[PDB]
């Protein structure tokens, strides 16, 4: 149980590092400072959304009688935004070409 | 920059409701690009918001004001 | 009670070679019902936020945008 | 050309809502309905083609209603059926329990 909580922390603070990075980049382009609390939030929010990308990806595969998540599963996930789906289908046509 | 493939993987695994559930590789890359987009989006909508309030500092209330719409447009 | 065949007919019209099964149209029906339920809940609260006692098109449109989004698969 | 009754949609909507509703507002509700059926149509095409079937099975729908946010942990599908479905329609969904 404790080992889990430790995984939690390493992760949460991980998504925090990357969040803060992406966050700065947007900050430079747009020319505005993000409060620390701002990035904190964006971070937690990202973390939470993960739970639903997760449980929906689980669902999405196990519906194909499968335990292993494919590019197809991400695409299905991403179907609900035409812009978003267009873009991730692009990223997968780049990634598929190897 | 971006998200570490491994951390994505451990993040997805954390929330799975059945032990045996696992993720392929090119998936993990795409879940990475996807996460990046979600974050750059929250950041930019919040910044948009602040900037349109004639503010230099993007503050937490901006993340909240844009948050509900963000969750919608996205998944 | 259900215009079930009308259900199968609607979908056939959208997805012709998509064939349904069993009672599945009863669940599709239910999803539709619960869609309406949502659109109602939402639209009512949009009126009560408008200081209005009456459901007006503006309210229904707002709602349709949101609930219709919540409805995607 | 085919759809569920304008009148039935109106009935169901003004039931769940319990408020007077402008005629034109039901116009709107009906449009929104045409869109709903269109969308979930394309979806179920997807869910089925995903599990390798050319036919939509019951699990595709439960998957849908789950993905909508209707069927969840604290509110399971059998409940929705129990609450919002006419006795005659739940008998085939809840042959007993």
Curated annotation (Swiss-Prot), chain D:
Q: How does it assemble?
A: Component of the CENPA-CAD complex, composed of CENPI, CENPK, CENPL, CENPO, CENPP, CENPQ, CENPR and CENPS. The CENPA-CAD complex is probably recruited on centromeres by the CENPA-NAC complex, at least composed of CENPA, CENPC, CENPH, CENPM, CENPN, CENPT and CENPU. Identified in a centromeric complex containing histones H2A, H2B, H3 and H4, and at least CENPA, CENPB, CENPC, CENPT, CENPN, HJURP, SUPT16H, SSRP1 and RSF1. Interacts (via N-terminus) with the NDC80 complex.
What is the gene name?
CENPT
- Specify the protein name: Centromere protein T
Q: Which residues form a coiled coil?
A: none
Q: Which family does it belong to?
A: Belongs to the CENP-T/CNN1 family.
* Localization: Nucleus; Chromosome, Centromere; Chromosome, Centromere, Kinetochore
- Full-protein positions shown: 533 to 629 of 639
Instruction: Cite the domain annotation text.
Output: The largest part of the sequence forms an elongated and flexible stalk structure that is connected to a C-terminal globular domain with a histone-type fold.
Q: What does the record give as the function of this protein?
A: Component of the CENPA-NAC (nucleosome-associated) complex, a complex that plays a central role in assembly of kinetochore proteins, mitotic progression and chromosome segregation. The CENPA-NAC complex recruits the CENPA-CAD (nucleosome distal) complex and may be involved in incorporation of newly synthesized CENPA into centromeres. Part of a nucleosome-associated complex that binds specifically to histone H3-containing nucleosomes at the centromere, as opposed to nucleosomes containing CENPA.
Other facts: Association with CENPA-containing complexes may be indirect and due to the proximity of centromeric nucleosomes containing histone H3 with those containing CENPA.
